[PDB]
């Protein structure tokens, strides 16, 4: 097999890259290897499509505006069982596979957790043999490349397709028209949506290999193209051709907002674009099937469509439009079938994230969908009036339309009424969703609302990113854990095995040494090998409280400066993440962190006790490097704000201990591992509510806590910005008068908890014993467990 | 060519079938149960490209190892057409691929018809570049084509309510299996900014950057081991406000390579066009210099790289003035970047460049406003001014008392808005200037650039155009190619002058019938196409009378239309009188902004409607406006043609190349003594062409006298009738005034003297009809045309450029 891989590599270099080795580039070698690897899954890819056609399993369609896929080469090698043989083949060719792997651009087609969940799910669904396709947009530009210039974030275009993508296949044959604008006529042959502008949707297919099985599923991503046909309704010829750019702009760039709604028309076009192309494709495949007594009675027995957040909410009225206006089904039948087809996953309760589209905007762009939405709402409110004749406010609360001045469509409400199942993403969150946020809806339909706790794939997030740990675990308990991560509980038998604990520590140490080389190469800071790696990587947000971590960094710095001879447990503090470009406070927080880092790293009285890195361009491939090197994972969102989290799970699986609040899935991590094996601190959700009731006065904490006062005064008075002493005035103002996330209220408990972490870190046996308990309890957080639950309780499909 | 018989030939076919199936599977990722005809086309295309990779690599190695002098053909246009069949033929793989595809149960014609034209040109100029690439590869020259990878080539033409409409030519929609992107050779191109004159010298600063990403297409020689390269540049925004809008605004940089300017023989001074011209020049020159420095002739001294040997290792041909900015750009690189003394840099520049002039029509001449150039390319304006100053200083020295000569010879047109005469820039910056046919090159030398050729009497040359006999005989007319080979062997393909051996069959009635049979087969096949696309019943015994070329006043499709109406009126006047039946086909694109050309199309379609539907005419006369004329369609209609219409006003068509294609493929020519028509008459004998009308001196005499169109209208009853019908609404009854603009032009503003050639043209046409009634005489004349067409091989043309301009040797 090694010999044939080398032969295949050389054939691709020659015929595919059209290069003699004398003038080949590193990129050429990457592409030759990529093609060699892709070739190994084509047979199963084709045979999987045949199998689904032949056997007609119910299909699952995961519809998302985001797929945060990272790099594909190593993941594909691992899932096909080819990694070791490819490593050896490339070595024999006089190359280094790790160098080739670094050439590949991330498919950064998402913002954070939501998009990464979609990615993990694809992997899990393929590994479980489900007839599942991911449907999304092939953005020409993904999440921006982040650079730091003078300590500030600057954005560069993520031109990930510049040199091509060997992991996609365009299928222009399957191109479909999407309509916009136009007008509606209610004719005696049905409602017609006419005089529209057309944009074509060209699909690109990327293979999704199951881990060591026969399944290769598909991620189909749509790209926007201008139509070619002359219309009699049709100026400068050259400008007309250039203006084709306007249609093509629909798939140009991912909106870089994490947990934040921006009601831009282009974003609405993206949402409808993906929905319209996807539903047409699904219906085409259904009609071509052996199920293709009218045509669509079997549709929800053959089709499940999962809505990833409310971003593809328009799928609901689009399916109704197709059923009623095109296929001529009665409204009642169409609506029955629609509800049985769709399920909706809610990912946040933060109000700034909620999608509320102005009715005037929807009327202009999608007049027929607005009609359909108004009719869904009418039939919905008619029911509520029937059940609660007197409750006028309940009608207001439950309407899909918010009438308060500027009328807006509540897309979450649309998703709830149009779906048979609604789930949150962690127990704490799903409860809030059910019993608070959508109380009025769950009361009327109790069985609709569910929980499906998030998860992560142990292929990318253990086998790939941490082969040392994966190997060590395999050596002790075999490799069944890869496909059933609950098998990690067997590691509990090795508590008290001191040789094993040393082996476990050595794996972490090797990871840290490797990541330290990266850090020294990229940042030219000298890393203390014996320091605790204290890491907070996630999107920059007020709710995630990178700011709270920064206060702790400054607290540590001041303690060292005040007592230089005192025992200090050394740390490398790493904070990274992107800020949404329009998010002013997040950008200020990045500048604060880089400003602190500059002072701390260059103070000769501090030296190797404490180094601070703002980790630039945080993304999936970089997550894979830092996570395995981490000792302490920071998961410190205000209680009630992080729906689940998944970075938390990645760190747990990779041998880090967690400092965190009782928020999102942190709560379930504590349940699985034991609360005493996490560093839990701070206000619980009820404590936060009590402070809201009483009223939050940040000044009181600043006055009462001397260490906080010095930290805040330093920030406020130019200690970290001597050339611009008032630089951080907006942060200070926010902290004292507009802090929705109560940073000062958790500061004391946070610092005391951090003190306990440092104490435990001085005791390697105790530390590593606690680590083992975390790894051994991490099995619940496999996305294979998550997908099995969706399959059984939402989609009604069986792993195969 | 590769055998399909015996042990080895069976294996050749077997390997091709295996490769096809491998590509369908691994490349297209399709089970045959779901494969489309397009999938099969791509699987074959990939297979065929695989078969030239070895030679392509070994060609590059050979040029590196032996360092022959390289020829770089720099053009804004490469009108390449389809590549699959051309490549199969040149590699000797057509028979084997045909057999493989047949054994797979597929129709290779259907697969071939899937391919989009690479329509990256407007007409003759762009197609000449394409023929040249084929010939340069066939002759083993170390030659690359350099151009722009337009996302959209020449628009697709449709006819709606009788008018041209344009659709975007989205030729890359399904991908291009021929090209290979080369990311690592990306180069920056600079725009705007300003010039700083400092202690360290002149710097061009504060510029905007656009990246140029090259894509390589293989250019296989006919039956040799050479595969040359066509490198086409694509514009990208650099890597490095509303964030979203900043990302969308990257479209502005990428717009530089978005679309081919669809003007044929017409200058439109648009800023985007100037950007295109600089883009291709800047990326190309950087790439050429990089290759030179990497070569065995690359060496460094105290200043750095010695460029002394540069013009011994590099020739750059400027296809028209479109890449004229190459001259000041090479000077900019030499002087500003490499720090060469101006004098030395200018000497090297002149020895490197040669310029081909393609037209003397004034509306075609590039004259860029200096203010536009100052804005976009401020350093190039400075360099152009300095070239002009030193140029005029020499003229002052030689002709101290001739002030008007300075005005005439300046690169700058000073009157009103100052403009740069790009032709003048090309002449002074080049060591050789050539026109494209004897008559044209003489006008260029002795009239248009008289002041320059007097000063430098050896600079000016002629290189008569040619066409490749691969695409334009072997490929498009296999029936004729086979017949010729049966009679005289297959050595004509590489030495087309061997066609004179066909004179052995003068008076051989068996051969003359064979020639007619080939034409008839072509006509029947093409008639099937016409009846599928058009509501017409084609008379299979009719003469196919064809005028296909871009729509222009100078090319006089309008004159042809007057003859069509004349024929119609004769039939109506005397329905029982004998009439030699014709199918009149006129085709070509109009530039979208060219009002008169668009009116002429509408006239032709309006006439067609009347003629085709008049029951008194019936099968005597049918008229077709052939839509979307382009290279692949030219390959179909040309071999089906009996009479080739080449009727430009004397002095206006620099050469023409359609004329040559028709001659090679067994049509007789009706034409004026213009461009290469004059040379076709020389080769075949003037008595074997239907030559008519004013010659160039007659046109000059009429200009001097003053042209009064109404005199012809009053003197020629048949013309009067035609014009009155057009003017009065006979061809536009629902809109009687529709053709007012055509009538006004013809009477008061006709620079091309349509009425002045009408009488001679119609009389000449009468002679054609008479000959067509005598198949033996007709086909005897055809034989004499085919037999004399050897001069018009572009292999002959390229050998002359090689010897007399580039100083390179066929290998
Ligand atoms: C087939 C082909 C066509 C165009 C360009 C390339 Cl890069 C390729 N591939 C390729 O293999 N090129 C060469 C192979 C060689 C093999 C042995 C010895 C020399 C070789 C040179 C090339 C080659 O194309 N070199 C390019 C060039 O001549 O354009 C060279 C390389 C680096 C900088 C400048 C030019
Ligand atoms: C690997 C792959 C992934 C996605 C799409 C395709 Cl077209 C391919 N290639 C492919 O060969 N697909 C199929 C092969 C089959 C072989 C035997 C029997 C049935 C097969 C079906 C497919 C296939 O993908 N068909 C598509 C589909 O299921 O998406 C089908 C075809 C035409 C209209 C609608 C759907
Ligand atoms: C896992 C992951 C996330 C989500 O992290 P959280 O801490 O749960 O917000 C975001 N970005 C990347 C690149 C990830 O891999
Ligand atoms: C050969 C050719 C031309 C040039 O034709 P002329 O009659 O010489 O102007 C123009 N267009 C196409 C498609 C051609 O093949
Ligand atoms: C709208 C949005 O991006 N929500 C995010 O979704 C992911 C995946 O469910 C959660 O882990 C995270 O807590 C939450 O902030
Ligand atoms: C500017 C331009 O396109 N000129 C054209 O060039 C071709 C190629 O030489 C000639 O055959 C033709 O007569 C001439 O009109
Ligand atoms: C105020 N604000 C923003 O303005 C913002 C954002 N994310 C993106 N943007 C622009 N978030 C989370 C936010 O709170
Ligand atoms: C007047 N005119 C035009 O306007 C024109 C053209 N070709 C393109 N355009 C726009 N020609 C040849 C022309 O003579």
């Amino acid at each position: 097999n090694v010999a044939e891989l080398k032969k295949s590599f050389n054939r691709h270099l020659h015929f595919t890259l059209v290069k003699d080795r004398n003038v080949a580039t590193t990129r050429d070698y990457y592409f030759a290897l990529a093609h060699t690897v892709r070739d190994h899954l084509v047979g199963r890819w084709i045979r999987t499509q045949q199998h689904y056609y032949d056997k007609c399993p119910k299909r699952v369609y995961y519809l998302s505006l985001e797929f945060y896929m990272g790099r594909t080469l190593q993941n594909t090698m691992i899932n096909l069982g080819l990694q070791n043989a490819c490593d050896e083949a490339i070595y024999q060719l006089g190359l280094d596979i790790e160098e080739l792997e670094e050439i590949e651009e991330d498919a950064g087609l998402g913002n954070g957790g939501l998009g990464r969940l979609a990615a993990c799910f694809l992997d899990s669904m393929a590994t479980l043999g489900l007839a599942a396709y991911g449907y999304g947009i092939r953005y020409e530009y993904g999440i921006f490349n982040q650079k730091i210039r003078d300590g500030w974030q600057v954005e560069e275009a993520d031109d990930w397709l510049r040199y091509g993508n060997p992991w996609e296949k365009s299928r222009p044959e399957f191109m479909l028209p999407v309509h916009f604008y136009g007008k509606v006529e209610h004719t005696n042959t049905g409602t017609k949506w006419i005089d529209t502008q057309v944009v074509l949707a060209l699909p690109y297919d990327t293979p999704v290999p199951g881990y060591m099985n026969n399944t290769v599923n598909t991620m189909r991503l749509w790209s926007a193209r201008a139509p070619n046909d002359f219309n009699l309704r049709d100026g400068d010829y050259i400008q007309a051709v250039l203006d084709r750019n306007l249609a093509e702009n629909i798939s140009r760039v991912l909106y870089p907002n994490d947990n934040f709604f921006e009601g831009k028309e282009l974003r609405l076009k993206q949402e409808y674009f993906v929905v319209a192309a996807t539903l047409q494709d699904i219906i085409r495949r259904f009609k071509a099937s052996k199920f293709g007594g009218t045509v669509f009675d079997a549709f929800p027995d053959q089709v499940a469509i999962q809505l990833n957040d409310t971003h593809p909410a328009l799928a609901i009225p689009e399916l109704m439009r197709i059923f009623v206006d095109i296929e001529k089904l009665p409204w009642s039948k169409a609506w029955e079938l629609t509800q049985k087809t769709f399920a909706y996953t809610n990912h946040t309760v933060l109000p700034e994230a909620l999608e509320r589209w102005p009715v005037d905007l929807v009327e202009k762009l999608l007049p027929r969908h607005l009609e359909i939405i108004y009719e869904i709402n009418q039939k919905h409110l008619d029911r509520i009036v029937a059940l609660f004749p007197k409750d006028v406010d309940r009608l207001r609360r439950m309407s899909l339309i918010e009438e308060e001045g500027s009328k807006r469509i509540n897309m979450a409400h649309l998703c709830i009424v149009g779906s048979h199942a609604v789930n949150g993403v962690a127990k704490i969150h799903s409860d809030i969703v059910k019993t608070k946020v959508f109380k009025d809806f769950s009361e009327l339909e109790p069985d609709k609302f569910q929980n499906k706790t998030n998860g992560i794939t142990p292929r990318r997030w253990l086998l790939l990113c941490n082969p040392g740990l994966a190997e060590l675990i395999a050596e002790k308990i075999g490799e069944d854990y890869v496909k059933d991560l609950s098998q990690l509980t067997k590691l509990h038998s090795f508590l008290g095995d001191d040789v094993f604990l040393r082996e476990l520590a050595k794996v972490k140490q090797e990871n840290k040494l490797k990541f330290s080389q990266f850090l020294e190469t990229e940042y030219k800071v000298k890393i203390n090998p014996s320091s605790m790696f204290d890491v907070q990587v996630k999107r920059i947000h007020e709710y995630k409280r990178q700011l709270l971590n920064c206060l702790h960094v400054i607290t540590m710095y001041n303690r060292i400066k005040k007592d230089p001879k005192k025992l200090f447990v050394p740390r490398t503090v790493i904070i990274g993440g992107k800020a949404a470009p329009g998010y002013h406070m997040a950008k200020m927080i990045i500048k604060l962190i880089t400003s602190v880092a500059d002072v701390v790293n260059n103070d000769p009285m501090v030296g190797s006790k404490l180094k601070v890195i703002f980790l630039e361009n945080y993304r999936v491939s970089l997550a894979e490097k830092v996570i395995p090197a981490t000792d302490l994972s920071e998961q410190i969102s205000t209680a009630g704000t992080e729906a689940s989290g998944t970075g938390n799970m990645k760190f747990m699986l990779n041998g880090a201990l967690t400092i965190g609040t009782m928020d999102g899935a942190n709560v379930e991590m504590a349940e699985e591992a034991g609360e005493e094996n996490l560093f839990i601190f701070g206000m619980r959700i009820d404590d936060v509510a009590a402070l809201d009731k009483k009223g939050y006065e940040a000044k009181e904490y600043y006055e009462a806590l001397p260490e906080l006062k010095l930290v805040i005064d330093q920030i406020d008075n130019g200690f970290f910005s001597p050339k611009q002493p008032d630089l951080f005035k907006d942060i200070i103002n926010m902290l004292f008068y507009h802090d929705r996330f109560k940073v000062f209220a958790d500061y004391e408990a946070y610092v005391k908890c951090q003190d306990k972490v440092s104490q435990l870190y001085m005791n390697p046996k105790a530390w590593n014993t606690m680590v083992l308990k975390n790894i051994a309890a991490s099995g619940k957080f496999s996305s294979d467990r998550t997908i099995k639950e969706y399959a059984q309780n939402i989609w009604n499909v069986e792993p195969s």
Side-chain angles (χ1 to χ4, degrees), chain A residues 18-20 22-23:
Chain A
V18 195
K19 282 289 191 78
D20 187 87
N22 287 297
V23 295

Side-chain angles (χ1 to χ4, degrees), chain A residues 68 111-113 116 461 537-539 544 618-620 623 635 642 645-648 650:
Chain A
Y68 208 14
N111 278 287
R116 182 57 229 176
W461 299 114
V537 288
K538 49 187 74 249
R539 289 294 294 264
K544 291 174 188 287
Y618 183 67
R619 64 197 188 282
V620 173
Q635 309 290 337
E642 190 76 84
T646 54
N648 53 1
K650 298 170 195 168

Side-chain angles (χ1 to χ4, degrees), chain A residues 438-731:
Chain A
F438 306 111
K439 182 178 175 291
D440 294 320
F441 294 85
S442 61
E443 287 177 355
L444 304 194
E445 304 180 282
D447 294 335
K448 175 171 289 192
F449 283 78
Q450 303 185 28
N451 174 63
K452 299 281 161 276
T453 298
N454 277 350
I456 55 164
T457 177
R459 274 71 67 177
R460 180 172 302 273
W461 299 114
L462 175 57
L463 299 213
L464 197 159
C465 63
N466 201 343
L469 184 55
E471 188 189 334
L472 179 59
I473 297 168
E475 285 162 353
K476 295 313 189 276
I477 63 163
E479 57 174 7
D480 282 348
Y481 75 88
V482 187
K483 290 189 189 192
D484 175 19
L485 203 64
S486 70
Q487 296 303 304
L488 293 181
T489 62
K490 292 185 175 166
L491 293 173
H492 205 262
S493 297
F494 298 86
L495 290 169
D497 182 341
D498 280 329
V499 176
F500 180 69
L501 292 176
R502 277 184 254 258
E503 292 166 339
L504 186 65
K506 188 173 169 61
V507 165
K508 181 58 65 179
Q509 188 58 39
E510 294 165 342
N511 294 337
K512 285 171 68 166
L513 291 172
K514 186 174 189 55
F515 195 63
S516 301
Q517 294 164 350
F518 174 92
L519 289 180
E520 293 194 339
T521 296
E522 297 287 316
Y523 299 92
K524 300 208 154 92
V525 167
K526 185 73 216 163
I527 304 299
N528 181 344
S530 50
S531 65
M532 177 205 310
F533 281 22
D534 173 354
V535 183
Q536 192 181 15
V537 288
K538 49 187 74 249
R539 289 294 294 264
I540 309 307
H541 269 281
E542 283 165 281
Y543 89 84
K544 291 174 188 287
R545 296 197 301 188
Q546 287 91 4
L547 192 44
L548 176 55
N549 189 352
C550 197
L551 302 188
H552 178 246
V553 173
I554 297 164
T555 302
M556 283 187 297
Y557 170 80
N558 292 337
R559 288 176 177 186
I560 291 169
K561 293 299 291 302
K562 189 162 77 70
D563 196 348
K565 305 316 207 320
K566 190 180 196 293
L567 156 69
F568 185 88
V569 178
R571 295 199 187 201
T572 303
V573 175
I574 303 172
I575 305 180
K578 295 174 179 174
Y583 190 0
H584 177 67
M585 193 57 58
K587 284 182 149 172
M588 295 305 306
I589 288 161
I590 291 176
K591 179 54 176 181
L592 179 60
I593 298 164
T594 65
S595 292
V596 172
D598 278 358
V599 169
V600 173
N601 296 345
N602 293 294
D603 192 319
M605 185 162 313
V606 171
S608 71
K609 286 182 176 182
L610 185 59
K611 297 296 188 186
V612 183
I613 299 296
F614 187 85
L615 186 69
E616 303 186 9
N617 206 29
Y618 183 67
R619 64 197 188 282
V620 173
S621 65
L622 183 54
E624 293 162 17
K625 298 178 167 65
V626 63
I627 292 179
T630 299
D631 294 305
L632 182 69
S633 164
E634 301 268 356
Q635 309 290 337
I636 65 176
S637 59
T638 312
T641 64
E642 190 76 84
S644 167
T646 54
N648 53 1
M649 301 167 188
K650 298 170 195 168
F651 283 105
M652 190 188 192
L653 185 53
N654 278 278
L657 300 184
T658 299
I659 181 165
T661 52
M662 282 301 206
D663 197 24
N666 293 3
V667 183
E668 287 163 80
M669 289 165 53
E671 289 176 7
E672 297 303 290
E675 201 171 317
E676 77 271 22
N677 296 309
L678 280 76
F679 289 96
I680 299 293
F681 74 91
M683 289 176 294
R684 309 268 164 121
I685 195 159
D686 294 350
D687 302 309
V688 174
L691 191 46
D692 283 330
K693 189 179 198 190
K694 162 173 162 76
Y696 175 56
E697 207 69 53
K699 181 184 140 298
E700 295 181 5
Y701 298 92
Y702 166 85
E703 302 292 6
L705 299 167
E707 288 192 289
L708 186 55
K709 177 163 196 308
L710 176 55
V711 170
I712 293 305
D713 287 345
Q714 282 167 324
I715 295 166
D716 193 36
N717 295 301
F719 185 90
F720 294 109
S721 58
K723 308 318 199 206
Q724 324 166 240
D726 70 346
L727 179 56
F728 299 119
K729 64 181 142 295
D730 297 342
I731 298 181

Side-chain angles (χ1 to χ4, degrees), chain A residues 194-232 234-363 365-389 391-398:
Chain A
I194 68 176
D195 294 354
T196 55
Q197 262 85 63
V198 174
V199 179
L200 302 179
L202 161 43
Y204 289 72
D205 289 343
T206 292
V208 176
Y211 177 75
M212 299 300 290
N213 69 7
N214 291 316
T215 302
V216 180
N217 284 342
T218 301
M219 181 178 59
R220 173 161 287 182
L221 300 185
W222 301 102
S223 180
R225 299 286 178 265
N228 285 334
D229 290 314
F230 174 83
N231 286 1
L232 195 54
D234 312 333
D236 182 65
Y237 163 79
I238 294 290
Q239 192 61 51
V241 175
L242 300 188
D243 287 349
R244 293 169 64 89
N245 294 344
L246 300 174
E248 287 157 15
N249 284 344
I250 293 169
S251 58
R252 197 77 68 184
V253 58
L254 170 70
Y255 272 83
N257 298 316
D258 183 273
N259 270 293
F260 186 80
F261 173 64
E262 209 186 327
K264 295 288 182 173
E265 191 188 24
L266 186 58
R267 172 62 173 201
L268 182 58
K269 288 179 180 173
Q270 289 181 335
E271 295 184 346
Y272 184 64
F273 176 76
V274 68
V275 154
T278 297
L279 279 173
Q280 278 181 83
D281 201 43
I282 288 174
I283 289 164
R284 173 164 57 185
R285 185 175 299 102
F286 175 77
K287 289 181 175 190
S289 69
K290 300 172 178 188
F291 285 88
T294 51
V295 183
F296 291 99
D297 289 347
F299 189 84
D301 301 317
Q302 281 284 290
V303 173
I305 305 170
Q306 194 69 28
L307 308 174
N308 199 16
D309 211 321
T310 66
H311 312 153
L314 287 167
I316 287 154
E318 176 63 9
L319 191 64
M320 285 295 289
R321 188 191 72 84
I322 295 171
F323 281 162
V324 176
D325 297 349
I326 301 176
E327 303 294 346
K328 311 302 204 175
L329 301 185
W331 179 278
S332 54
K333 187 57 140 135
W335 186 239
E336 171 196 336
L337 297 177
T338 297
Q339 289 171 93
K340 290 166 68 174
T341 297
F342 289 110
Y344 157 57
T345 303
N346 176 291
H347 293 267
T348 190
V349 298
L350 290 172
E352 59 271 30
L354 310 193
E355 287 198 294
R356 290 142 65 244
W357 289 106
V359 301
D360 288 5
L361 189 62
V362 185
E363 182 167 5
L365 190 70
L366 306 166
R368 184 52 178 150
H369 295 79
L370 186 54
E371 291 188 349
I372 291 170
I373 289 169
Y374 283 148
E375 181 59 14
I376 290 168
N377 196 42
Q378 187 61 70
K379 288 164 163 142
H380 165 65
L381 292 175
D382 284 351
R383 181 159 84 174
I384 296 167
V385 172
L387 302 172
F388 308 90
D391 205 331
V392 177
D393 199 52
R394 190 176 180 117
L395 288 187
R396 183 192 63 77
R397 292 194 310 273
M398 297 189 80

Side-chain angles (χ1 to χ4, degrees), chain A residues 93-211:
Chain A
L93 290 163
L95 300 167
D96 184 340
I97 199 163
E98 286 174 4
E99 181 163 7
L100 305 192
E101 288 161 357
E102 283 299 320
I103 294 285
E104 183 177 358
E105 298 290 333
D106 284 49
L109 310 184
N111 278 287
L114 179 154
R116 182 57 229 176
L117 191 72
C120 285
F121 279 8
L122 291 197
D123 184 85
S124 280
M125 289 187 296
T127 295
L128 294 169
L130 301 184
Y133 300 160
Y135 274 105
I137 300 179
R138 179 179 177 268
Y139 302 109
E140 183 168 0
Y141 300 99
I143 188 64
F144 64 89
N145 283 320
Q146 179 197 57
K147 303 280 194 79
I148 299 296
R149 293 269 175 281
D150 250 82
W152 298 93
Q153 162 174 302
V154 304
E155 300 99 21
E156 289 190 351
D158 168 40
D159 191 20
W160 72 292
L161 297 169
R162 180 174 283 194
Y163 306 135
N165 170 2
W167 305 111
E168 66 184 12
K169 182 62 196 78
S170 59
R171 316 270 198 199
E173 321 89 82
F174 295 130
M175 190 148 43
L176 291 164
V178 176
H179 298 265
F180 292 103
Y181 300 111
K183 68 193 187 191
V184 180
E185 301 187 337
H186 303 101
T187 84
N188 71 4
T189 62
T191 299
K192 312 301 188 203
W193 180 22
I194 68 176
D195 294 354
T196 55
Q197 262 85 63
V198 174
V199 179
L200 302 179
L202 161 43
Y204 289 72
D205 289 343
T206 292
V208 176
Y211 177 75

